[PDB]
């Protein structure tokens, strides 16, 4: 796979080549792949390869990454969340959105 | 996503933002998401976002989390289990 | 499972007995298994055991492995990719 605008990767803390889970709100499909950087400012979310069987242009998805850490750090951990609307317009809060 | 009464998270040792597996006894679906806290005492189990395609109101589910540790520790590890019946009554 | 020509395992850094993900471009199925070596130069990709229900002879697949490391290392990590066409001809 999934190519993603590098600005969106930065906001979510996701790394190029990192494992990602993709949860398709439109069709309910759930799959795991890895992230590819797309050009900054492109606003691209491209599902490539076998993943193209699981999502279509226009589908609304949640793209997540998971990391491991000891329990004590986990208990105060704050995920990096980016919220979208419209033409893949990114916001920092939920909470704003139609 | 899945929002879960904080008392239930406390009993099972499940953290807010932790990866969780949900195994649906009613319809057999199996999926992985992350935990969100719901108000303590509400007895809520809310499936949010894409996960709503995998569970319906009234379905009976098992919610699990997994941790890693060295083999020596794993040999004596004890999981945190909470049992429910009825309308999410613990015990 | 999946038996894979050793040359191909060498190119991708995939180990015998390592967990692998298989993503089937032809039919969309996605599954997880482990790698077995096949004879070097055979160009074999054999789906064995239960995995035979998920792929047929002639299906085009992507086979991947994943590793863990600290964030500082992960920022510059480079995966080992091998590209194929035709009858499993590498490059």
């Amino acid at each position: 796979x999934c190519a993603i605008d590098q600005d969106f990767l930065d906001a979510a803390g996701i790394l190029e080549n990192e494992a990602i889970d993709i949860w398709n709100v439109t069709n309910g499909k759930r799959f795991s792949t890895y992230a590819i950087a797309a050009e900054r400012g492109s606003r691209i979310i491209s599902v490539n390869g076998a993943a193209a069987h699981c999502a279509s242009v226009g589908d609304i998805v949640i793209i997540a990454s998971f990391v491991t850490m000891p329990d004590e750090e986990a208990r105060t951990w704050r995920p990096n969340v980016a919220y979208f609307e419209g033409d893949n317009e990114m916001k920092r809060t939920a909470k704003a959105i139609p | 996503x899945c929002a879960i009464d904080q008392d239930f998270l406390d009993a099972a040792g499940i953290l807010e933002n932790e990866a969780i597996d949900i195994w649906n006894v009613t319809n057999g679906k199996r999926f992985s998401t992350y935990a969100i806290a719901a108000e303590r005492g509400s007895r809520i189990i809310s499936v949010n976002g894409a996960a709503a395609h995998c569970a319906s109101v009234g379905d009976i589910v098992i919610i699990a989390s997994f941790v890693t540790m060295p083999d020596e520790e794993a040999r004596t590890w004890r999981p945190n289990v909470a049992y429910f019946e009825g309308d999410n009554e613990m015990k | 499972x999946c038996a894979i020509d050793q040359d191909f395992l060498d190119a991708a850094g995939i180990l015998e007995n390592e967990a692998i993900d298989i993503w089937n471009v032809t039919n969309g199925k996605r599954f997880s298994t482990y790698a077995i070596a096949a004879e070097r130069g055979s160009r074999i990709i054999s789906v064995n055991g239960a995995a035979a229900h998920c792929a047929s002879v002639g299906d085009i697949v992507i086979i991947a492995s994943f590793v863990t490391m600290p964030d500082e290392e992960a920022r510059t990590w480079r995966p080992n990719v091998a590209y194929f066409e035709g009858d499993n001809e590498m490059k």
Binding site: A12, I62, A94 | - | -
Partner: peptide, 27 residues
């Protein structure tokens, strides 16, 4: 030493729209 290790949501892109789909991607 021997610490118990959790799997935690690192981050997410919430309700992004898919812009392209390429079954035959060559990368």
């Amino acid at each position: 030493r021997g610490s118990m290790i959790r799997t935690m949501l690192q981050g997410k892109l919430h309700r992004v729209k898919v812009t392209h789909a390429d079954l035959h991607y060559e990368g």
